[PDB]
Amino acid sequence: SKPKAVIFDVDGTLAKMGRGPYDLEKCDTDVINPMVVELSKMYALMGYQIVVVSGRESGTKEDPTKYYRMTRKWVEDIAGVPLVMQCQREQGDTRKDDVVKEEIFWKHIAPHFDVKLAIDDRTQVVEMWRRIGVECWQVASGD
Amino acid sequence: SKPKAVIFDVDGTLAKMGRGPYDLEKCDTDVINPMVVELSKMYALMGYQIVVVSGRESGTKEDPTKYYRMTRKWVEDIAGVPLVMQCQREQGDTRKDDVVKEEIFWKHIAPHFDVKLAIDDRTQVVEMWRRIGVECWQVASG
Numbered sequence: 001s002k003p004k005a006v007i008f009d010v011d012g013t014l015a016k017m018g019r020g021p022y023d024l025e026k027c028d029t030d031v032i033n034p035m036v037v038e039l040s041k042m043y044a045l046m047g048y049q050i051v052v053v054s055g056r057e058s059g060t061k062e063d064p065t066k067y068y069r070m071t072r073k074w075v076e077d078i079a080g081v082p083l084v085m086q087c088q089r090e091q092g093d094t095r096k097d098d099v100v101k102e103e104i105f106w107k108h109i110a111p112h113f114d115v116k117l118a119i120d121d122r123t124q125v126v127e128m129w130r131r132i133g134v135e136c137w138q139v140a141s142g143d
Numbered sequence: 144s145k146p147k148a149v150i151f152d153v154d155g156t157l158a159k160m161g162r163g164p165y166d167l168e169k170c171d172t173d174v175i176n177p178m179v180v181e182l183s184k185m186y187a188l189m190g191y192q193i194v195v196v197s198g199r200e201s202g203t204k205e206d207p208t209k210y211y212r213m214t215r216k217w218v219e220d221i222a223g224v225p226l227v228m229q230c231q232r233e234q235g236d237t238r239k240d241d242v243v244k245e246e247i248f249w250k251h252i253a254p255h256f257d258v259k260l261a262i263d264d265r266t267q268v269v270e271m272w273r274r275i276g277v278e279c280w281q282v283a284s285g
């Protein structure tokens with residue numbers, strides 16, 4: 001009986017989409033998506049553990065966690081999401097989001113949490129969560 | 144300065160979809176979609192006005208609000224959702240869900256509420272909400 005959890009995505013979900021999508025160097029200035037961010041705070045107060053998962057590459061070759069650290073600072077200090085765990089696509093991983101996010105899920109999250117719900121904006125990712133038996137709410141079209 | 148509201152759909156959203164659509168008298172025995180129903184309680188507690196909107200025809204030719212009243216009772220008594228307003232397809236309206244729900248929005252919801260969010264399951268409707276500038280979360284495939 002693992003503690004109950006909710007997974008949130010970052011891009012398009014917690015954070016709005018102002019810059020280039022793969023231009024992570026400017027991602028520290030992203031704008032919060034208010035209802036989704038409020039949702040994460042709501043779930044945390046209700047005793048769900050919040051887990052953040054992003055397809056953002058963690059960094060560059062010379063700085064492998066550069067973007068992970070930027071993302072984390074944005075989530076924690078700008079959005080104020082009270083997460084207990086953050087997971088990203090490792091530097092050099094070029095597979096599709098749904099493939100990576102599924103791997104992250106089975107390897108790092110599922111053994112520790114009982115994930116009741118995932119929040120995301122991309123159809124391919126949304127269908128993956130649903131397919132492996134995780135309720136998922138799509139919060140935007142994803143285009 | 145209107146009160147903030149969240150719109151919830153009923154079929155496939157608040158209620159799981161053992162019964163057929165348009166068989167609305169076996170409708171009283173629907174089972175809750177728990178994460179969504181819990182959401183509506185949370186929002187209500189956080190001071191949002193809960194507005195339930197549904198494509199279900201409101202009743203029969205003989206009784207124009209028979210189905211409306213059945214839906215209302217399930218939402219209030221079984222789901223436990225503290226709603227403030229309920230809007231459905233009028234008896235004998237045969238237009239599409241998204242045309243009906245949009246007309247409901249302009250005439251009965253938008254004048255009284257600042258709608259911050261709509262929760263729904265059907266793609267055609269979800270697209271309508273986003274198209275008219277209302278954030279919408281799609282909680283299952285449609």
Ligand SMILES: [Mg+2]
Nearest residue numbers: 009011012121
């Ligand atoms: Mg995203």
Ligand SMILES: [Mg+2]
Nearest residue numbers: 152154155264
């Ligand atoms: Mg529906």
